[model samples]
Target chain A: MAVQIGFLLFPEVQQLNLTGPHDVLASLPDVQVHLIWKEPGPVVASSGLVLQATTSFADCPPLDVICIPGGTGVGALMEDPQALAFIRQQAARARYVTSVCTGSLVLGAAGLLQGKRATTHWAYHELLAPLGAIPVHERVVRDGNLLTGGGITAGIDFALTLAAELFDAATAQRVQLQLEYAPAPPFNAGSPDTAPASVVQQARQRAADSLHKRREITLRAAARLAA
Target chain B: GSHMAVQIGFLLFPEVQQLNLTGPHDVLASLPDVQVHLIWKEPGPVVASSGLVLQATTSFADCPPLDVICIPGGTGVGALMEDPQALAFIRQQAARARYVTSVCTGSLVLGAAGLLQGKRATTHWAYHELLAPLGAIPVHERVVRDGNLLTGGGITAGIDFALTLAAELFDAATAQRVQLQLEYAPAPPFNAGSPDTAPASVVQQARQRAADSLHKRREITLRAAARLAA
Candidate 1:
């Protein structure tokens, strides 16, 4: 069976959030994945990597799955009417409506998260409360057809989980083998709970400004969404 | 205490394993002083093996000397093994590069360029044996560093490889911070990342599925090795 998947592409997006899942989902047999944005063009990611959007919002084909990836750009994306409208339109008819990292915030902004159990990056998990989403502290949370994942790296697990659901366990396992998904990280500081106190403090301090900005935007967006 | 920006370039080619490049690119770009470039024969869009299209920021002809040079592996590497222009670019860059690196089968391209001779390295588990023919001392490790010749195992190993390099280029503290930022902690649903850990049947099927590519890659590798010998 042929499957069509599309990811929302925005400037300053966390490249891995999209690329990680894109790699797995695209590897599926007979699956076509597209990077969709307002227009087809090169969008610079938060990591400074430039990615090409293959499909424009107007021209995107009906998708079996639609995913939104979070990054520093998410604050702005949550406020973009065009993007939110596109997401709302797609989520209505899509088989699976999903987000990775703070992308869940964007989903919340689009008014899709109301009364749904969801998750996002650890830093922004509480922000979901304002969006009417019951925040779940998990790597990947699924409530009916709405799926969400945690933090930047969580996209890998999130996509594999979706892969298992999309196809079958055997297919997901084969793709995992192909990508050699076995991970051996030299450091154990990937999350607040696991990282050293100093490292976690520094991480929060470094992202303090962005975090504050995201909080402001999320609050305002939540208020507007409430109306 | 800032010096010049660290110049890092990744060879972007068609059919490249996207994660091999992206996984590292995202990590390395987190460095304080770094300029990362996606390079190809020409500046344009390069479609990966998974159909993810990444833009090449620079071309070999116009690319500057990179302090760290990386090549990501995929089905496209077989062509790179024979591309005189691409091989010449790598040889030129490696001569001055502080570190020469690759992930997955990308090491085979380096070997084809005559850089891996006597250099201990590693690649994807499925193609680990192919490294010997390319003059690389195949080491079965997630990440191997022989002098400045750094190689990572398989595709996802790119993340580990980058963090290791980050610590080398900067410090352990910096690498750890980047790891936390990217949340490098991983949780694989299945423990089939290696042939040793995967179910015997799954491994058999994986190898069977890749039999055609493996056969063609072996043929190309032998030819490339012969050329190196000549």
Candidate 2:
């Protein structure tokens, strides 16, 4: 059977969060990828790139894997009951439940990360605990069937890791080389720990208002999930 | 300027290496006053070579004068090389675009449009030989810039290419901010990104698997070169 994969698509999603993994997984042999959402049509991502949703939550088939990628829009997604329910239902049967960047929060909000070790974007690492997850500091973290990646770009690594598990190391390696996955970052500012204090501070300051709003929304979502 | 100022357009063709477009698109989108567009022959979904479908925001007929025009190469590029309408569109855009760029074999697309004659360019390592027939001076580098024409090497180089372009368009500080926001630090688990670094067996297999496409592309390149000579 084809390895069926589904990615949750919402408005304002970090386009790369979905695109990175989608590109990797979609390249796998005998795989069918579905970009799903509550509605069917064009979904404008946070990066302003428009992506098309191939299936609606109501019509999505049983998936072998379900990935929720993070973005500024995820705060609203956490508060979305239907979206959460879709993730819950799919994760229950999926061979692997996965997330990238702030996507871990959505998985957490769906109650799948309770007592589970996961990871997310460095900016939001501390917020995972409130959502019932033990956040690990790593590029990619896996505990049982739950796999999580850090930040936006980590999705590539996360997907390749999953690919190796799903198929074989050779297959994953082939995909990596084919995509020319040798990464050469022009700078070393990918993480809060690695970036200069000034850059990190600037990053935090730029995200302050949005982060504050998300923190409140996350707490409210946690309360709802608890209730 | 609509909501954002500078307008950048990417040619979103069927069977494109999605990363070539997405990598740069993501990085460039983070610029403060810039709007990114995916332009195609039509305004609809174009399935990438990887089977991931992406939506194009504007059609060639509807596109405005763009500041930057980029094309990404993949399995479907051979067909694009022979497509007259697409070539015309690219030439038309390159005439006015401040920056004309390509990723991977997309540089071949620029060459096919007769824009790369004697220009320093680079493409995917495997297709480096194809550059000369199209009248391009092949540069072995991640990103090559000859005046306003920029070409990136291979698939993943789009990130480096875009970051470089981001710095050129704005400033290093602006590009660094976007880099930090996206957490662009890459950590690949393998050392097989290129033929030079990959194991011989792996490189053999990759070349073997792509042999058919490579042969096809060679034929198309020759035809394109002859047409250019005409």
Candidate 3:
């Protein structure tokens, strides 16, 4: 059996969320990495980097691990029935249903997170509650088969943790060594709590603007999840 | 093929250290008014060393005048050292690019292209000694900046290299903002990222795995060095 892992790539998705975990998961032997989107051709991320999707929802193969990444564009996906349907289908059968950053919201929108312990990016962690998911504050949380990670860069941590779970601790360490997974950050500002007050304010302010829109959108998406 | 005021090109190829490219690609691509391209010989999908396939949108022949040309490191850097097609392309761009950068052994490729002569650089901790042979003063640091040539260590160092470069290109404030956007505060689970920190056994294993490639790289380095000197 092929150890297949697929990433859902859509317009305005965070490329790092895809790339970071891709580095870890793809390092394994005899694995298949699929880039899935709703449409064919290329999907330009919110960062303006163009990424080509390997398969569309209609043609997607069954995956062992299904991953959803998050970014600013994910807000628009809150009420998107088409995307929700795909997530619901993949989550039902996949051994692991996972997300990084705000991608958890997408899973929540799909109604898979109801009564499940999950997590999202720091800024949006509370929002998971409204969707019937108990929001966890940890960097990477695994409740049985559901794995959710924190903000952007935490995808790397999420991948490493998942690697340990999927394989053995020793195998994960080797992959970590291979990728030089030993990270040394020059600055200490990965989270809002850790960042300087001014920088935190800036990040919060910028995010706050679109968050209002996200709130409205999430309400509609939650209703759709109910429907 | 798309144009932006700040265009950065990262070469993609088979057997590339995926993290070396993706780490920086994620950080730099997050910047405002910037466009990043994964350039290769042609516009198609290629398998990376990690078994991931990334699509290269721009080919060398049609690659625009990039403001920054970032060569990411991997085992594939050895073949690149001897490939005239790749070296010549690096030379052409380095001649005019505002900043020419490398992460890990990508600096070795730049050295082979004759761009790192008499410059201070850094690479993966395991291969820092190899830099002297390529006519580059091996600097022991996470990030090194010698003129327009900026070099970084190992795979994950690409993140720091990019943020530093971003600070230079824009400002510390702008880089900080970008860092926050990506949530780049790193927390590694291991302490074996560098030779100075890795245990003797882990370092031995790293060296053992790299021994064959390093041997092949020495021959390429000598040949490329002689050509650069001539």
Candidate 4:
């Protein structure tokens, strides 16, 4: 069967969070990959990078895999009822549902992660439980058909693991080899736990400021979920 | 062919490194006259090795003749090597392509196409010797240019390779302009891109983690070479 994978795009999404995995998934033979937005045209990334989408939410087909990658824009998306509804609808039908970085928080807000083991970018794993999830503190956490990976960089590991599950070890291994999956980050600042105290401290400080915005959006999304 | 846009097809699949393809995509798409197309087997949305996803414009059979074909390194190459159809398509297109290149271990896929025989190439530092089995001389360099075929070392080398290709295609002026646009001035905080430059402990740990991945890739390349010969 032809695998159709759809990535949800929203305003202010992170460029690398989406583009990094987009390149990997597009490499799959016999896979149909497209970007779906609430409204089409172009979506500007959090970093001001503009990307043109291939389709809109209404036009997207039943996706085999639906990925929601996170960024600063996600805080705003959490408040969008239509976006939540669209994600909920898509996640319900998708064989495999996944998120990278804070995208897991969006899934949590949709109530799709209720009572399910989940994860998010390390800095925000604490927030997963508020949305009713058992947060896993790993680079890539797979619970049933849902996979969540860590912050900005963990997306690679998440996709590799997903590739293993969807295809096979050989397939995943091949993909890893092709990408030279051997990652050697120049700095230990990639992860919160591994990073220097100063880096982690600064990241937390930024996250704290963003928390207020996230709470407002989540509350709004929760109200919509209740209705 | 003159009327046709110069198509540059990038092979993306699960576990493929995002940087290998994107670095080039960013560079090539900036060119004024080139119409860059991202081609895969299917066209909906494909997830990348990094959990990010991209929508492809064309599929393998439907894509136009590629002037430049790039195969990026990632875990996806293992599965791709087993795909006879992909190998066939790559071989056919590369045979006529103006330039063919691979960044990192992507050279392994090009080797599987039976096109690297007697060619000098480079890949990620960890797998330089792996190219030897494919009848290619592996050069320990940042970028190895063997006529129309090009290969670069590791992820960041894609930027350099793309610059070289741009210079070759249009002129040095165009390449330099694109480079400036990309702000190609890289200031890596650490000089640990290669084992030679890294701390011994860092290199050891890296090698240990890579051992299994390397072994699997070696087996896949051998199998692919045999399949190609058959």
Top candidate when judged by lDDT against the true structure: 1
Cα lDDT listed for each candidate: 0.87, 0.86, 0.80, 0.72
In model 1, the runs with Cα more than 4 Å from the true position are none
Each model's RMSD to truth, in Å? 1.6, 2.2, 3.2, 11.5
Evaluated against the true structure, the overall lDDT of model 2 is 0.86
For candidate 3, the docking band is acceptable
Q: Candidate 4, B25: how far from true, in Å?
A: 11
Candidate 1, B1-230: lDDT as tens digits: 76678999999999999999998898899887988999998888899987777889898988998899999999899899999899999999999999999988999999999999999999888888889998888899888989999888767787887888888888788888888876677787777788888777888899998888888889989988998855
Model 3: per-residue Cα lDDT over B133-183, one tens digit each? 788988888788898888887677778878777877776776777777667
**Residue B153 error for model 1, in Å?**
2.4
DockQ for candidate 3, C-alpha atoms: 0.46
The parts of candidate 2 lying over 4 Å away from their true place are B1-4
Instruction: Provide the lDDT at A207 for model 3.
Output: 81
Q: For chain B alone, what TM-score does every candidate structure achieve against the true structure?
A: 0.96, 0.94, 0.94, 0.95
Worst 10 residues of 2 chain A by lDDT: A180-189
- Best to worst by TM-score, what's the order? 1, 2, 3, 4
Q: What is the interface RMSD of each candidate, in Å?
A: 1.3, 1.5, 2.2, 10.7
| Model 3: colliding residue pairs | A12-A46
Candidate 1 chain B has its poorest 10 consecutive residues by lDDT at B181-190
